[PDB]
Automatic annotation (TrEMBL):
Organism of this sequence: Streptomyces lividans 1326
Family: Belongs to the sigma-70 factor family. RpoD/SigA subfamily.
Name the UniProt record assigns to this protein: RNA polymerase sigma factor SigA
Task performed by this protein: Sigma factors are initiation factors that promote the attachment of RNA polymerase to specific initiation sites and are then released. This sigma factor is the primary sigma factor during exponential growth.
Region (Sigma-70 factor domain-3): 23-89
Self-association state and partner proteins as the record states: Interacts transiently with the RNA polymerase catalytic core.
Subcellular location per the Swiss-Prot or TrEMBL entry: Cytoplasm
Domain of life: Bacteria
Length: 89
DNA sequence: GGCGACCCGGCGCCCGCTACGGAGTCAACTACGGGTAGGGGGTATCGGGCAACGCGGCACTGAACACCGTTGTCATGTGCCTTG
């Protein structure tokens, strides 16, 4: 499990995330999932911040850092021929 | 045992442009240890603002000469009157 999780942290995401940011983001994600499961509603950012014990600015920071790129070579969907990489200047 | 079908894969394409919708995603943890990165603290080095001098144009110094220009000046020449 150690080797597998190290590999997932260090080689899964297109934009590399440090291992301890990786555990921070997965911790906040799983606990937020628990918040949704308990309260049955999207938790407010301040409540999440206190649950994580960090301040809201770190919450927003890791939330924004925990994304993944979208591929240009995808159909635009407006038309089959068109692709996303041919619409951004 | 090369022919033979047939079989199968395997591939290759599948009119033109504009113009025309949106979007966005399920499964660890903590301990250490370093190294860097930032913070303020303090310090040597470079840059911007004022006083003394030098010029430079012209300007005054007119003073001292020069340039016409003027009415000073005049010993010396025409015109009338008196006498040979």
């Amino acid at each position: 499990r150690q080797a597998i999780t190290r590999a997932m942290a260090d080689q899964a995401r297109t934009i590399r995330i440090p291992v301890h940011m990786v555990e921070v983001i997965n911790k906040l994600a799983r606990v937020q999932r628990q918040m949704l499961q308990d309260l049955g509603r999207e938790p407010t950012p301040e409540e999440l911040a206190k649950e994580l014990d960090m301040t809201p600015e770190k919450v927003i920071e890791v939330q924004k850092y925990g994304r993944e790129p979208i591929s240009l070579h995808t159909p635009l969907g407006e038309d089959g021929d068109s692709e996303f990489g041919d619409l951004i200047e």
